[model samples]
Structure formats: C-alpha cells, structure tokens
Target: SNAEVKVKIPEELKPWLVDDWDLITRQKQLFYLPAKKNVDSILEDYANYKKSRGNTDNKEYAVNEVVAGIKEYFNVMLGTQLLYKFERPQYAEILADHPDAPMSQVYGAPHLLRLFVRIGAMLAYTPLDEKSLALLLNYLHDFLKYLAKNSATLFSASDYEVAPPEYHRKAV
Candidate 1:
C-alpha cells in the first residue's frame, strides 16, 4: 500500500515545526506528553512563578501565565539543543573515524514534557469534574491559537539552508 499522498506540513505549523527544532520541541512537548505526566501541577507551578514576579491577577491569570513560561522554556532549551547538535557532528564524525575522540560526557536532558492537546482526551470516559475539564480544554485551545497566529512567518529558511560552527568551542 504505497500511496503517493502529497501531504505538506501545514504552512501554519511548519514554521514552528521545521528547520528550527525548538518549535518542533515546543509543539511535540506541549501537545502530547500529558498522557502519563502530572501536567496539571506543572502548569500550576508556572502560574505561581508569575504571581511572585509582580503579576496582578486572579487564578485564571496564573493559568494564563503558563503559556508564556512555556515559550521561555523552549527558547532556552532550543539554545542548548542547538549547542549540542552543533558539537555533535564533529565528535560523532571523529569518533567514527578514529575512535579517539573519547566518549561524550554530555548528559542529555531527559525529554518528558507533554503538550496539552490530548490533555483531556480521557474526559469522555473518566468521571472528571467540570471545572478541571474546562481548564484543560481552555489552555489547549489558547496555545494552539497562539501557535497558528505566530508561526506563519517564523520560518524564512529554504529547506536546504546549512547550520553552524562558531559556538562549537564553548558548546563542546
């Protein structure tokens, strides 16, 4: 069944998902990991961090703050990933060639973050309270909406663009 389907990355989400891996990290993490994790508490923690930082608002306001926290988290994580990917090829190549590069002591981060899209999929069969259900749905909707609007112009690269090597010394 080799169907020749011509599916393109939705022009909308492609920016966030292609080329720059952060958005890939963001989309996947934000939209899928809730299945086995205590995502509710993770969102709540971000909500609290905002309150201490002079945020003046109600409970939902804290819920709202979680989205921004995610953006910042992804930005920083992307920087780290870029550093790793940049250094990775060199060591990988040398190790393959001579096996003398020594093993990388790099402790890659465990990726466990989940997106909220499938956040409430279990609601249909589970007897969950209305309040919790609404909270999950609302946040997922908001994040997706934000993704659609912001991602359109973010990817300006041709699919064939090359990456980098400048920060390799520090990154290595």
Candidate 2:
C-alpha cells in the first residue's frame, strides 16, 4: 500500500509526516500548518509530506491532515469552481454526516481517529472513529483498489483499526 504511494507521488511530502518524528515526540506536541497562502506550496508541502510518510504512520497523519484540510476545503470549496476537482462524490455526505463530530471527519486512519479522540478529545481531536474511520479507510481502499484493479469495485475491502491495546500501548 505504502509502496504504491511511494512509487507514484513525487519525492516531496516526506518530511511533514507525524511519523518523521519519534513516537514520543508525536505524543507531546501540537502541529500547525504554515499559512497555506498558495495552492502550489500547499501541494508542494503535501507532496513532501506524502513522500516522507509513504510507509510510516505519517501517511495516515498526512491523510488525516489532508482529510482535515479536506473538511476545510470542503467547507470553503463547496458550491464553487475550485470545488469541482476535490469533490469526490461521497465527500458532501461525509461532511454533512459528521457536522461538529470528530468521528465524522475521518480522512484516512479510522481506528486511530476514534482511539485518539475518545481518550484525548481535549488534547487531541480528530475525525477518527468506528463509523468515519471505517468509511474513510474503506473509501481509500476502494479508490486505490479501483485505480490498481480498474474494475474490481471495493465491495468489501478490508481495513486497519487501532485497537484499545494499540492505544494503551502508546498511552501507558
């Protein structure tokens, strides 16, 4: 899965990943995007982040970040011209379903989203949960699966979930 992304995306978007830093470092921090003043730089940063996080959880982080941006972009890009490119058929329903709910905002890492939120809603807030995470992960799997397979619809593709122990392993 990471290989596909590694092979395709330009060699940018590698460093901005959450996994680029140590795991402990990840637990004790707040990350903020630079003022995304231009789309080129935003794209450039995304490329770099993706490149850095291809195999790492950083990819999930980027996915989460991009997904969060997806929400923002969804918010701003709605009912406009720029919105057409990003508008995947399922996006509106996704955002609308999750209004003000982190679980509804899942961009990529579904299991982690819920695990991260339930325990750290105050310190860490994200759109990961049983529902949205499943939705997003299934969404990606289907998208990538289609891109690769060309015809096999992602009827029931599998996914990854951050189990309770997975979170406690890090938390404790």
Candidate 3:
C-alpha cells in the first residue's frame, strides 16, 4: 500500500530540496530546516527531506527527521487548514458515537501528532525505543495515505515546474 505523493501543491512548495550542507557537512548533523527565515521554504525543506531520504540506513535518524518536519508544519504552516480539507468528512462518521469530540480533535493524523511529540520530547533526553519506531512507521503510513488520496491536488497550480519520476508515480 505504499505510494508516492504526486500532489499538485502550491508553486511555492516546488523545488529541488537541496541537501542540508551546512548541517550535514559543517555541523555534521541532520536537520529538517536549514538556517532560513521563510516558513514556506522551511516547510518545503522538510517535505524534500522526507522525499529525499531514499533507501538509506539509520532508522531513528530517518524517523526523527521526518517527524520533526511534520510537527513543524503541523505547528505553524497548515495545521487545521490542510487537515480540515482532508478530514472534515471524518467528523460526521466519528461524531456518530462520540458526540463530545471537538472539531480540532477530529482532524487527521492524531497518531502522527502524538508520535511527533513523544519522539520530540524524548529526542534530547532519552534513546528511542521500539514502540516509538513502530509509532513513527504507522504515522508515516497514514501521512502518505492522506497524500495519495489527494496528491494530485495537494498543492496549488504550477505549469513551469516538472516533477520527477517518483512524483509522477505518486500522483494519481
């Protein structure tokens, strides 16, 4: 059930997602966002990070990087706007039994949010466990699932940019 994110997102989100040379090379560390000042750029960087990480090693390293990007976007860029667009219908189905659930709580990727926080909280203090890794993998599955369902229109219109082969494969 693994698929690609072939969404037509906003033009601003399109880019080659250059490597984090500053961190990856100079700082000798992996980072989600570079030393930049723009929100879209930062978010785009994270998206690229997720896509750029091909069949690489280091599970914790990989998981943490992607989770950090998702959490960052969830926190600032498109928390409920994107979620509402995708998850609004789920509310009706969910409220049938739990009428007390708030709209904010009914949005998409709650499991992702939880794992992001849990991993993020433990990131600086403790070592990651199997439970955290499993949660991360589950969250990744749901995140991409949401994209595949709406990958073509996930982004805004843009005719100048050319998505790579993987992007096309991900798009429906």
Candidate 4:
C-alpha cells in the first residue's frame, strides 16, 4: 500500500491556498485577455528569482525539475480539471485563435494559483520518492512566497475583459 502523502502548506501561503470563489462566480462576465504577465512569464521570473537567491548546482537542478513539473501539470490539467464551466467557452475560443498556444501563455497568475490549490492532489497521482517530494514542497513554498510578494504586479483585475453580449446568452 502507498503511504499517505501530505504536503505542509507554509503559514504565509495558507491564505492563498484556497479557490477564489469570487473569481469563479464572475467568470461569465470575465474574458481572458492575453495577460501582460501570464504563467509562462511568471515562471520564467520565478526561475530568475531563484537564480538571484544563488542556488548550488544540485539545488538549481532540483528547482528546475520542479518548475518543469508545475508547467506540465498546468498543461495537462488546464482544460480538463482547472477550468471553470463558464471559462470553458472562452478557453475554446482562445485555442481556436492560437491553436498552438500553451496553457501557460493562455492563463495568468490567478489561474495558476488555482492550480496550486489542487496541486497536492495532482502530485499524489504521480510516483514520487520522499526526497523528491520534500524538494518539491520546499520549492513550491518559495514560489508561493514569491507570488504573494509580487501579487500586486502579477495580478490585475483589468486583465479580464468584460465579456460580450453573447457570453450572457441564456437557453430558451
């Protein structure tokens, strides 16, 4: 039998580790504009932030692996698990325009933060040793701190355009 794996959320990140119910409720009124800093850029910035913290080669390798894991998680789960019911139509339209766009480019910090809310369950489905899981948890904590610190610049209400009339259509 597999042992239970529990990820400890840092005290500072606890506030951020829940779904943004307000955002979810507003999805029908909100459209995704290309974010000034989408998931791809945010992760790239996090990578640079880690480098500035001066990791050793081994630490760098571990961090990079975890970052890649996060990106892959978003890619696999975006359409199927992460999207809200109302956002599904918007996602489809975005994909139609940019058929090759990665979810990282299509989504931003708010959506990426949603991924963090569910990431523990997602990772549980993967095979991981204790050491690797510990490394990932540490990096995730660091990234959460970074995100929280930069929240003002990385997240903005204006990034979501007001949805058009068709977005409000009701079934007869």
User: Which candidate comes out best when scored by lDDT?
Assistant: 4
Where model 3 places Cα greater than 4 Å from the true spot, the runs are 1-73, 76-126, 157-172
| Overall lDDT per candidate, in order of appearance | 0.37, 0.32, 0.37, 0.70
Instruction: Give one clash count per candidate, in the order shown.
Output: 8, 15, 8, 0
Cα-lDDT of candidate 3: 0.37
lDDT of 2 by residue, 1-172 (tens): 2211111211222222223222224333211111113233333434455556465765666555654554454334333422222223224444576555332223332111122212222212353445665555554343333223321221111221222343344333
Q: In candidate 3, what residue range of length 10 has the lowest lDDT sum?
A: 12-21
Q: List the residue pairs that clash in candidate 3.
A: 6-171, 7-151, 8-152, 8-155, 9-155, 9-156, 10-155, 10-156
Q: Which candidate has the highest TM-score of all?
A: 4
Any runs in candidate 4 off by more than 4 Å, and if so which? 1-20, 124-131, 161-165, 170-172
The root-mean-square deviation over C-alpha atoms between each candidate and the true structure, in angstroms, is 13.1, 18.7, 18.6, 3.4
Over the stretch 1-172, how does candidate 1's per-residue lDDT look in tens digits? 4322222323555433443455232222111111222223334444565467676767556566555554444444432433334435443443466453222111111121212212223234464566775665556455445435433432232231233334234234
lDDT over C-alpha atoms for residue 150 of model 1? 38
Q: Weakest 10 consecutive residues, lDDT, candidate 1? A: 28-37
Better of 2 and 4 by TM-score: 4
Off by over 4 Å in 1: 1-11, 14-60, 71-137, 158-160, 164-172
Model 1: lDDT to the true structure:
0.37
- What tens digits encode model 3's per-residue C-alpha lDDT throughout 11-102? 32222111212222233332111122223333344455555766455654565566566656455433343333222233344555556643
- Models ranked on TM-score: 4, 1, 3, 2
